[PDB]
Amino acid sequence: EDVFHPVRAKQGMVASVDATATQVGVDILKEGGNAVDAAVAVGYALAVTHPQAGNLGGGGFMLIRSKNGNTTAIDFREMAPAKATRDMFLDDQGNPDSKKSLTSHLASGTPGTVAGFSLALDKYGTMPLNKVVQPAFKLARDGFIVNDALADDLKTYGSEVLPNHENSKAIFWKEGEPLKKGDTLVQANLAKSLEMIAENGPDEFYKGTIAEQIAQEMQKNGGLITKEDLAAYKAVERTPISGDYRGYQVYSMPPPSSGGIHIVQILNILENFDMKKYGFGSADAMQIMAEAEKYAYADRSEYLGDPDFVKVPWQALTNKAYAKSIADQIDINKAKPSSEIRPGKLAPYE
Amino acid sequence: TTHYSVVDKDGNAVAVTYTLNTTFGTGIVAGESGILLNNQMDDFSAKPGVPNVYGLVGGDANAVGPNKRPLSSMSPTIVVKDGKTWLVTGSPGGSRIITTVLQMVVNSIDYGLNVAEATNAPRFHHQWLPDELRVEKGFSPDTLKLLEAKGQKVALKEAMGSTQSIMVGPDGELYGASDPRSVDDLTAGY
């Protein structure tokens, strides 16, 4: 009856953008590690097999829900350097320069991935860091075959930045061209970094040799990340943002992410409509959702930011009465131009 | 960004979304560490009212500041049914993460699609500014004409996201789905 079939398993399962990383996660589960152990192992593996986004030099979020229902969020989003300033990306005329925030050394925030994975592993995992890093270490040391996904990304997106930096080019470029499908990608330097983290712990990244390498890279090229920045970084466990949609409870990331709040806000709006009745791919369902989305993004532009710096009115934004006031504005037969939509007035729902 | 999901034999679940921001980030490796550096700073509002790479805008709340965490759209998500973990999902896509995940939830709850069906279904997106109803290939010409008649400004663009999800059955059985939009990915278990 179905055209599309899910993969099935009776014990454990891992879903990721990379076959190798997924298999690393499954093997960890088979060895007895829990979901967190496997998640960290996958995260480290992707930092090697999916350099496009898997990383040690970036940041992210983790949602954890124990078998007992305990649900929590881990914020390991990058922190702007201590020397960062409000107008740092403006040119002499006062206009933002996308080059500065996307391709220069000023575009980087202090990495939180290593801190986040260790916070989760130490509190909710069962295996030592060395054990979950080992798979990634071997992949970096011995290398892996470049597949279609990686080859395509290196050629398309990589060409715009990788060959412009000596150290990056030495790793991802070959014979003057991006590595091709079938080639073997060995990352010896990354392997060393992984080995040191495995042996010395997360401090290796934030206070050790890696920290020194990051600080120097920045200092020599006009970047701002310093050793003080790295030593001051910290992942933060925060309460998830959640809601109730037709009896289902939805949990996602809280500020510094806008995801949880707007997903809940929009679901709150949609709850006022008989979505099932309209059905997937119907003009009515798409109309209602497109309109609801407008109000959420308008609110996003005004009320969302790092909660440690600004008070986010999350209660009001996820308030069902507020959602109802928005739903009553949606005309299923007439879209409202964005020019007529502004951030909502939250006072009545504070 | 890349997202991955995990559910173990005991029923514990984890959803992780992490990133360098754009593909390969700055493309800058940190010295001899072999580690690529992120360009997450573009997620801050550089100037009130001016859009960033994803067309998102801001003001004081998301303005750049020392030690501040730039606003994200990353949404690792878990939906609970009958008191138990039911759907574990998430996806990359910058500003589109919110709507892609939203659609996974709506597809699962309102349309009763299995995890693979919800994953392979086409996606649409509207982020207020720019004022356009972005759509992927896959929607009926009849439906798109009705949307235009309603006043929507339909814009056919590149595929959106890469959901990597796991749905948990009432008996603990696991169902998973990788995204057709991403080649070489995998959902596997035991």
mmCIF file of N, CA, C and O in Angstrom, chain A residues 258-343:
data_model
loop_
_atom_site.group_PDB
_atom_site.id
_atom_site.type_symbol
_atom_site.label_atom_id
_atom_site.label_comp_id
_atom_site.label_asym_id
_atom_site.label_seq_id
_atom_site.Cartn_x
_atom_site.Cartn_y
_atom_site.Cartn_z
ATOM 1 N N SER A 258 15.877 29.558 17.857
ATOM 2 C CA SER A 258 14.521 30.063 17.671
ATOM 3 C C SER A 258 13.623 28.919 17.218
ATOM 4 O O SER A 258 12.404 29.070 17.141
ATOM 5 N N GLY A 259 14.239 27.775 16.933
ATOM 6 C CA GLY A 259 13.504 26.616 16.452
ATOM 7 C C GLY A 259 12.325 26.137 17.279
ATOM 8 O O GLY A 259 11.196 26.086 16.790
ATOM 9 N N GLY A 260 12.586 25.768 18.527
ATOM 10 C CA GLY A 260 11.518 25.285 19.385
ATOM 11 C C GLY A 260 10.355 26.252 19.513
ATOM 12 O O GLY A 260 9.195 25.871 19.350
ATOM 13 N N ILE A 261 10.660 27.513 19.791
ATOM 14 C CA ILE A 261 9.612 28.510 19.949
ATOM 15 C C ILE A 261 8.722 28.672 18.722
ATOM 16 O O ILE A 261 7.494 28.677 18.836
ATOM 17 N N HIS A 262 9.321 28.793 17.543
ATOM 18 C CA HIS A 262 8.494 28.986 16.363
ATOM 19 C C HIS A 262 7.799 27.731 15.862
ATOM 20 O O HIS A 262 6.730 27.818 15.266
ATOM 21 N N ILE A 263 8.382 26.562 16.108
ATOM 22 C CA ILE A 263 7.719 25.332 15.700
ATOM 23 C C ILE A 263 6.466 25.193 16.575
ATOM 24 O O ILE A 263 5.381 24.879 16.083
ATOM 25 N N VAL A 264 6.612 25.448 17.871
ATOM 26 C CA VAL A 264 5.473 25.358 18.781
ATOM 27 C C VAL A 264 4.448 26.446 18.467
ATOM 28 O O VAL A 264 3.242 26.183 18.439
ATOM 29 N N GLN A 265 4.924 27.663 18.222
ATOM 30 C CA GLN A 265 4.028 28.766 17.893
ATOM 31 C C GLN A 265 3.193 28.427 16.655
ATOM 32 O O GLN A 265 1.969 28.546 16.667
ATOM 33 N N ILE A 266 3.852 27.996 15.586
ATOM 34 C CA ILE A 266 3.132 27.662 14.367
ATOM 35 C C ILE A 266 2.172 26.493 14.573
ATOM 36 O O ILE A 266 1.050 26.519 14.072
ATOM 37 N N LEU A 267 2.596 25.466 15.308
ATOM 38 C CA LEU A 267 1.705 24.340 15.562
ATOM 39 C C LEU A 267 0.483 24.846 16.335
ATOM 40 O O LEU A 267 -0.644 24.420 16.075
ATOM 41 N N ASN A 268 0.705 25.766 17.273
ATOM 42 C CA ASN A 268 -0.402 26.325 18.043
ATOM 43 C C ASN A 268 -1.400 26.989 17.110
ATOM 44 O O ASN A 268 -2.612 26.849 17.287
ATOM 45 N N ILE A 269 -0.889 27.710 16.118
ATOM 46 C CA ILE A 269 -1.743 28.388 15.150
ATOM 47 C C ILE A 269 -2.509 27.350 14.328
ATOM 48 O O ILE A 269 -3.733 27.412 14.216
ATOM 49 N N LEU A 270 -1.782 26.383 13.771
ATOM 50 C CA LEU A 270 -2.389 25.343 12.945
ATOM 51 C C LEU A 270 -3.428 24.488 13.666
ATOM 52 O O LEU A 270 -4.349 23.956 13.043
ATOM 53 N N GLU A 271 -3.279 24.352 14.979
ATOM 54 C CA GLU A 271 -4.203 23.535 15.751
ATOM 55 C C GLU A 271 -5.644 24.018 15.615
ATOM 56 O O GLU A 271 -6.584 23.251 15.816
ATOM 57 N N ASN A 272 -5.805 25.291 15.264
ATOM 58 C CA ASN A 272 -7.125 25.893 15.103
ATOM 59 C C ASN A 272 -7.796 25.535 13.781
ATOM 60 O O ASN A 272 -8.944 25.911 13.539
ATOM 61 N N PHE A 273 -7.081 24.803 12.933
ATOM 62 C CA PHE A 273 -7.604 24.396 11.635
ATOM 63 C C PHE A 273 -7.642 22.873 11.544
ATOM 64 O O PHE A 273 -6.847 22.187 12.188
ATOM 65 N N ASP A 274 -8.573 22.348 10.754
ATOM 66 C CA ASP A 274 -8.690 20.904 10.575
ATOM 67 C C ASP A 274 -7.722 20.496 9.464
ATOM 68 O O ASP A 274 -8.135 20.192 8.344
ATOM 69 N N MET A 275 -6.431 20.502 9.780
ATOM 70 C CA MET A 275 -5.403 20.161 8.801
ATOM 71 C C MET A 275 -5.611 18.807 8.120
ATOM 72 O O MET A 275 -5.443 18.688 6.907
ATOM 73 N N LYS A 276 -5.971 17.792 8.899
ATOM 74 C CA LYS A 276 -6.191 16.454 8.356
ATOM 75 C C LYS A 276 -7.235 16.488 7.243
ATOM 76 O O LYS A 276 -7.110 15.791 6.232
ATOM 77 N N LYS A 277 -8.257 17.315 7.435
ATOM 78 C CA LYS A 277 -9.339 17.463 6.464
ATOM 79 C C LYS A 277 -8.836 17.998 5.127
ATOM 80 O O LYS A 277 -9.218 17.500 4.065
ATOM 81 N N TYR A 278 -7.984 19.018 5.178
ATOM 82 C CA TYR A 278 -7.440 19.611 3.962
ATOM 83 C C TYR A 278 -6.528 18.619 3.247
ATOM 84 O O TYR A 278 -6.618 18.446 2.032
ATOM 85 N N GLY A 279 -5.655 17.968 4.011
ATOM 86 C CA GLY A 279 -4.759 16.982 3.433
ATOM 87 C C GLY A 279 -3.465 17.525 2.859
ATOM 88 O O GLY A 279 -3.368 18.696 2.486
ATOM 89 N N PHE A 280 -2.463 16.654 2.780
ATOM 90 C CA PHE A 280 -1.164 17.028 2.250
ATOM 91 C C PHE A 280 -1.250 17.501 0.803
ATOM 92 O O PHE A 280 -2.014 16.957 0.006
ATOM 93 N N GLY A 281 -0.454 18.512 0.472
ATOM 94 C CA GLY A 281 -0.413 19.015 -0.888
ATOM 95 C C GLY A 281 -1.651 19.729 -1.391
ATOM 96 O O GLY A 281 -1.793 19.942 -2.594
ATOM 97 N N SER A 282 -2.550 20.088 -0.484
ATOM 98 C CA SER A 282 -3.757 20.807 -0.869
ATOM 99 C C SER A 282 -3.451 22.298 -0.781
ATOM 100 O O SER A 282 -2.640 22.723 0.047
ATOM 101 N N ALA A 283 -4.087 23.095 -1.630
ATOM 102 C CA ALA A 283 -3.855 24.531 -1.605
ATOM 103 C C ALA A 283 -4.267 25.105 -0.251
ATOM 104 O O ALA A 283 -3.607 25.999 0.279
ATOM 105 N N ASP A 284 -5.348 24.582 0.321
ATOM 106 C CA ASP A 284 -5.806 25.087 1.610
ATOM 107 C C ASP A 284 -4.799 24.853 2.732
ATOM 108 O O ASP A 284 -4.513 25.764 3.502
ATOM 109 N N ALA A 285 -4.252 23.643 2.822
ATOM 110 C CA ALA A 285 -3.274 23.345 3.866
ATOM 111 C C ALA A 285 -2.021 24.198 3.698
ATOM 112 O O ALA A 285 -1.481 24.726 4.673
ATOM 113 N N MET A 286 -1.565 24.343 2.458
ATOM 114 C CA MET A 286 -0.368 25.127 2.184
ATOM 115 C C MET A 286 -0.595 26.605 2.467
ATOM 116 O O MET A 286 0.295 27.294 2.966
ATOM 117 N N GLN A 287 -1.793 27.083 2.150
ATOM 118 C CA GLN A 287 -2.152 28.476 2.384
ATOM 119 C C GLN A 287 -2.099 28.785 3.876
ATOM 120 O O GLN A 287 -1.460 29.750 4.300
ATOM 121 N N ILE A 288 -2.773 27.957 4.667
ATOM 122 C CA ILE A 288 -2.821 28.149 6.110
ATOM 123 C C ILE A 288 -1.428 28.124 6.724
ATOM 124 O O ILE A 288 -1.087 28.982 7.535
ATOM 125 N N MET A 289 -0.613 27.153 6.329
ATOM 126 C CA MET A 289 0.733 27.065 6.875
ATOM 127 C C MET A 289 1.641 28.212 6.446
ATOM 128 O O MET A 289 2.421 28.723 7.247
ATOM 129 N N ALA A 290 1.541 28.631 5.189
ATOM 130 C CA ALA A 290 2.362 29.734 4.706
ATOM 131 C C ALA A 290 2.041 31.001 5.502
ATOM 132 O O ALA A 290 2.940 31.732 5.924
ATOM 133 N N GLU A 291 0.755 31.251 5.719
ATOM 134 C CA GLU A 291 0.339 32.433 6.464
ATOM 135 C C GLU A 291 0.817 32.374 7.906
ATOM 136 O O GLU A 291 1.369 33.343 8.419
ATOM 137 N N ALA A 292 0.616 31.233 8.553
ATOM 138 C CA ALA A 292 1.034 31.074 9.942
ATOM 139 C C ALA A 292 2.533 31.325 10.062
ATOM 140 O O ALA A 292 2.994 31.987 10.992
ATOM 141 N N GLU A 293 3.291 30.793 9.110
ATOM 142 C CA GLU A 293 4.737 30.960 9.112
ATOM 143 C C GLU A 293 5.177 32.427 9.053
ATOM 144 O O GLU A 293 6.162 32.809 9.685
ATOM 145 N N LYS A 294 4.444 33.251 8.308
ATOM 146 C CA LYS A 294 4.781 34.668 8.194
ATOM 147 C C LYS A 294 4.867 35.358 9.554
ATOM 148 O O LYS A 294 5.848 36.042 9.855
ATOM 149 N N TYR A 295 3.831 35.177 10.367
ATOM 150 C CA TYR A 295 3.775 35.785 11.687
ATOM 151 C C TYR A 295 4.904 35.312 12.594
ATOM 152 O O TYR A 295 5.442 36.093 13.377
ATOM 153 N N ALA A 296 5.263 34.037 12.484
ATOM 154 C CA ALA A 296 6.330 33.484 13.304
ATOM 155 C C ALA A 296 7.677 34.112 12.965
ATOM 156 O O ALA A 296 8.432 34.496 13.855
ATOM 157 N N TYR A 297 7.984 34.215 11.675
ATOM 158 C CA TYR A 297 9.254 34.793 11.263
ATOM 159 C C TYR A 297 9.314 36.290 11.549
ATOM 160 O O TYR A 297 10.385 36.842 11.796
ATOM 161 N N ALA A 298 8.160 36.946 11.532
ATOM 162 C CA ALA A 298 8.118 38.367 11.841
ATOM 163 C C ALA A 298 8.486 38.497 13.320
ATOM 164 O O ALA A 298 9.300 39.342 13.698
ATOM 165 N N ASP A 299 7.898 37.643 14.155
ATOM 166 C CA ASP A 299 8.192 37.667 15.582
ATOM 167 C C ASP A 299 9.658 37.318 15.821
ATOM 168 O O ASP A 299 10.312 37.910 16.677
ATOM 169 N N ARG A 300 10.167 36.354 15.060
ATOM 170 C CA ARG A 300 11.558 35.931 15.191
ATOM 171 C C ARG A 300 12.528 37.102 15.045
ATOM 172 O O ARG A 300 13.513 37.204 15.780
ATOM 173 N N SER A 301 12.230 37.995 14.105
ATOM 174 C CA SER A 301 13.095 39.138 13.820
ATOM 175 C C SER A 301 13.199 40.169 14.938
ATOM 176 O O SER A 301 14.129 40.973 14.961
ATOM 177 N N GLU A 302 12.259 40.128 15.872
ATOM 178 C CA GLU A 302 12.224 41.102 16.955
ATOM 179 C C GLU A 302 12.489 40.577 18.359
ATOM 180 O O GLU A 302 13.172 41.225 19.153
ATOM 181 N N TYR A 303 11.965 39.395 18.656
ATOM 182 C CA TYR A 303 12.064 38.851 20.004
ATOM 183 C C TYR A 303 13.100 37.790 20.323
ATOM 184 O O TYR A 303 13.315 37.487 21.497
ATOM 185 N N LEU A 304 13.748 37.238 19.307
ATOM 186 C CA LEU A 304 14.700 36.159 19.543
ATOM 187 C C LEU A 304 16.176 36.516 19.604
ATOM 188 O O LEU A 304 16.686 37.256 18.766
ATOM 189 N N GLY A 305 16.855 35.949 20.598
ATOM 190 C CA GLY A 305 18.276 36.181 20.779
ATOM 191 C C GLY A 305 18.804 35.332 21.923
ATOM 192 O O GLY A 305 18.059 34.552 22.514
ATOM 193 N N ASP A 306 20.088 35.476 22.228
ATOM 194 C CA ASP A 306 20.720 34.730 23.314
ATOM 195 C C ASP A 306 20.020 35.125 24.615
ATOM 196 O O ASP A 306 20.074 36.284 25.020
ATOM 197 N N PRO A 307 19.373 34.162 25.297
ATOM 198 C CA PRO A 307 18.662 34.430 26.553
ATOM 199 C C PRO A 307 19.540 34.940 27.691
ATOM 200 O O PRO A 307 19.038 35.523 28.651
ATOM 201 N N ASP A 308 20.846 34.723 27.591
ATOM 202 C CA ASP A 308 21.750 35.180 28.637
ATOM 203 C C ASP A 308 22.034 36.671 28.485
ATOM 204 O O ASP A 308 22.637 37.289 29.362
ATOM 205 N N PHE A 309 21.592 37.249 27.369
ATOM 206 C CA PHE A 309 21.804 38.670 27.104
ATOM 207 C C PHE A 309 20.512 39.469 26.999
ATOM 208 O O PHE A 309 20.486 40.666 27.292
ATOM 209 N N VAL A 310 19.444 38.809 26.572
ATOM 210 C CA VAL A 310 18.158 39.473 26.428
ATOM 211 C C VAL A 310 17.029 38.560 26.882
ATOM 212 O O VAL A 310 17.112 37.339 26.749
ATOM 213 N N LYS A 311 15.977 39.154 27.431
ATOM 214 C CA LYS A 311 14.841 38.376 27.887
ATOM 215 C C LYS A 311 13.963 38.036 26.688
ATOM 216 O O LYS A 311 13.472 38.926 25.991
ATOM 217 N N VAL A 312 13.787 36.743 26.437
ATOM 218 C CA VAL A 312 12.962 36.281 25.328
ATOM 219 C C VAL A 312 11.565 35.966 25.860
ATOM 220 O O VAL A 312 11.414 35.185 26.796
ATOM 221 N N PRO A 313 10.524 36.578 25.275
ATOM 222 C CA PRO A 313 9.138 36.351 25.705
ATOM 223 C C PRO A 313 8.607 35.026 25.170
ATOM 224 O O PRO A 313 7.597 34.986 24.461
ATOM 225 N N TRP A 314 9.285 33.940 25.525
ATOM 226 C CA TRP A 314 8.907 32.620 25.037
ATOM 227 C C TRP A 314 7.522 32.163 25.477
ATOM 228 O O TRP A 314 6.828 31.467 24.730
ATOM 229 N N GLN A 315 7.115 32.551 26.682
ATOM 230 C CA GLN A 315 5.804 32.161 27.179
ATOM 231 C C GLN A 315 4.726 32.762 26.285
ATOM 232 O O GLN A 315 3.823 32.061 25.832
ATOM 233 N N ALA A 316 4.833 34.059 26.020
ATOM 234 C CA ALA A 316 3.860 34.738 25.174
ATOM 235 C C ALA A 316 3.861 34.165 23.760
ATOM 236 O O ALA A 316 2.806 33.895 23.187
ATOM 237 N N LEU A 317 5.052 33.971 23.200
ATOM 238 C CA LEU A 317 5.170 33.449 21.846
ATOM 239 C C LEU A 317 4.581 32.051 21.672
ATOM 240 O O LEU A 317 4.120 31.703 20.584
ATOM 241 N N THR A 318 4.589 31.253 22.739
ATOM 242 C CA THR A 318 4.056 29.895 22.661
ATOM 243 C C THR A 318 2.692 29.765 23.339
ATOM 244 O O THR A 318 2.208 28.660 23.592
ATOM 245 N N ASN A 319 2.078 30.912 23.614
ATOM 246 C CA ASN A 319 0.768 30.989 24.260
ATOM 247 C C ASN A 319 -0.321 30.655 23.238
ATOM 248 O O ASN A 319 -0.343 31.221 22.144
ATOM 249 N N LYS A 320 -1.220 29.735 23.584
ATOM 250 C CA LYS A 320 -2.277 29.351 22.652
ATOM 251 C C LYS A 320 -3.283 30.464 22.357
ATOM 252 O O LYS A 320 -3.858 30.503 21.270
ATOM 253 N N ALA A 321 -3.498 31.366 23.312
ATOM 254 C CA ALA A 321 -4.427 32.473 23.095
ATOM 255 C C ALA A 321 -3.827 33.408 22.046
ATOM 256 O O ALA A 321 -4.535 33.941 21.191
ATOM 257 N N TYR A 322 -2.513 33.605 22.115
ATOM 258 C CA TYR A 322 -1.829 34.457 21.146
ATOM 259 C C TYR A 322 -1.918 33.785 19.778
ATOM 260 O O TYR A 322 -2.179 34.438 18.766
ATOM 261 N N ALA A 323 -1.717 32.471 19.754
ATOM 262 C CA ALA A 323 -1.785 31.723 18.505
ATOM 263 C C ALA A 323 -3.177 31.850 17.898
ATOM 264 O O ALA A 323 -3.327 31.942 16.682
ATOM 265 N N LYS A 324 -4.191 31.856 18.755
ATOM 266 C CA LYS A 324 -5.574 31.977 18.309
ATOM 267 C C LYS A 324 -5.816 33.350 17.682
ATOM 268 O O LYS A 324 -6.544 33.465 16.697
ATOM 269 N N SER A 325 -5.200 34.387 18.247
ATOM 270 C CA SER A 325 -5.368 35.735 17.712
ATOM 271 C C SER A 325 -4.774 35.816 16.306
ATOM 272 O O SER A 325 -5.220 36.610 15.478
ATOM 273 N N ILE A 326 -3.767 34.988 16.042
ATOM 274 C CA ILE A 326 -3.126 34.959 14.735
ATOM 275 C C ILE A 326 -3.966 34.130 13.770
ATOM 276 O O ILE A 326 -4.186 34.527 12.627
ATOM 277 N N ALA A 327 -4.441 32.981 14.237
ATOM 278 C CA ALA A 327 -5.257 32.109 13.405
ATOM 279 C C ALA A 327 -6.501 32.842 12.907
ATOM 280 O O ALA A 327 -6.921 32.649 11.768
ATOM 281 N N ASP A 328 -7.086 33.686 13.753
ATOM 282 C CA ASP A 328 -8.280 34.423 13.351
ATOM 283 C C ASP A 328 -8.000 35.442 12.246
ATOM 284 O O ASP A 328 -8.926 35.934 11.602
ATOM 285 N N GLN A 329 -6.725 35.754 12.026
ATOM 286 C CA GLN A 329 -6.329 36.716 10.998
ATOM 287 C C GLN A 329 -6.095 36.060 9.640
ATOM 288 O O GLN A 329 -6.047 36.737 8.613
ATOM 289 N N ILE A 330 -5.941 34.742 9.638
ATOM 290 C CA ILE A 330 -5.686 34.018 8.401
ATOM 291 C C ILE A 330 -6.923 33.812 7.537
ATOM 292 O O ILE A 330 -7.914 33.232 7.978
ATOM 293 N N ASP A 331 -6.852 34.297 6.299
ATOM 294 C CA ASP A 331 -7.940 34.146 5.339
ATOM 295 C C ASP A 331 -7.509 33.028 4.392
ATOM 296 O O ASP A 331 -6.565 33.190 3.620
ATOM 297 N N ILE A 332 -8.196 31.894 4.462
ATOM 298 C CA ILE A 332 -7.855 30.743 3.635
ATOM 299 C C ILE A 332 -7.946 31.016 2.136
ATOM 300 O O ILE A 332 -7.453 30.229 1.328
ATOM 301 N N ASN A 333 -8.566 32.130 1.761
ATOM 302 C CA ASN A 333 -8.701 32.463 0.346
ATOM 303 C C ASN A 333 -7.929 33.709 -0.065
ATOM 304 O O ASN A 333 -7.999 34.129 -1.222
ATOM 305 N N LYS A 334 -7.188 34.299 0.866
ATOM 306 C CA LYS A 334 -6.437 35.509 0.548
ATOM 307 C C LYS A 334 -5.205 35.699 1.428
ATOM 308 O O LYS A 334 -5.318 35.914 2.637
ATOM 309 N N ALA A 335 -4.031 35.623 0.809
ATOM 310 C CA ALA A 335 -2.771 35.794 1.523
ATOM 311 C C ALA A 335 -2.571 37.248 1.938
ATOM 312 O O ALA A 335 -2.950 38.170 1.212
ATOM 313 N N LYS A 336 -1.985 37.447 3.114
ATOM 314 C CA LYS A 336 -1.716 38.791 3.611
ATOM 315 C C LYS A 336 -0.260 39.144 3.321
ATOM 316 O O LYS A 336 0.654 38.470 3.795
ATOM 317 N N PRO A 337 -0.024 40.205 2.533
ATOM 318 C CA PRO A 337 1.342 40.624 2.197
ATOM 319 C C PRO A 337 2.193 40.807 3.451
ATOM 320 O O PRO A 337 1.701 41.282 4.473
ATOM 321 N N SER A 338 3.465 40.431 3.370
ATOM 322 C CA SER A 338 4.370 40.560 4.506
ATOM 323 C C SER A 338 4.517 42.010 4.951
ATOM 324 O O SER A 338 4.844 42.283 6.105
ATOM 325 N N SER A 339 4.281 42.936 4.029
ATOM 326 C CA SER A 339 4.385 44.358 4.333
ATOM 327 C C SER A 339 3.302 44.792 5.319
ATOM 328 O O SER A 339 3.403 45.852 5.937
ATOM 329 N N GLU A 340 2.266 43.970 5.462
ATOM 330 C CA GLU A 340 1.170 44.278 6.377
ATOM 331 C C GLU A 340 1.292 43.473 7.665
ATOM 332 O O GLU A 340 0.395 43.494 8.507
ATOM 333 N N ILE A 341 2.408 42.768 7.812
ATOM 334 C CA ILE A 341 2.647 41.947 8.993
ATOM 335 C C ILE A 341 3.860 42.426 9.777
ATOM 336 O O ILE A 341 4.956 42.563 9.231
ATOM 337 N N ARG A 342 3.651 42.681 11.064
ATOM 338 C CA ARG A 342 4.716 43.140 11.945
ATOM 339 C C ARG A 342 4.783 42.224 13.160
ATOM 340 O O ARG A 342 3.892 41.408 13.376
ATOM 341 N N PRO A 343 5.855 42.334 13.959
ATOM 342 C CA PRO A 343 5.957 41.484 15.148
ATOM 343 C C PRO A 343 4.696 41.707 15.980
ATOM 344 O O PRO A 343 4.222 42.840 16.099
#
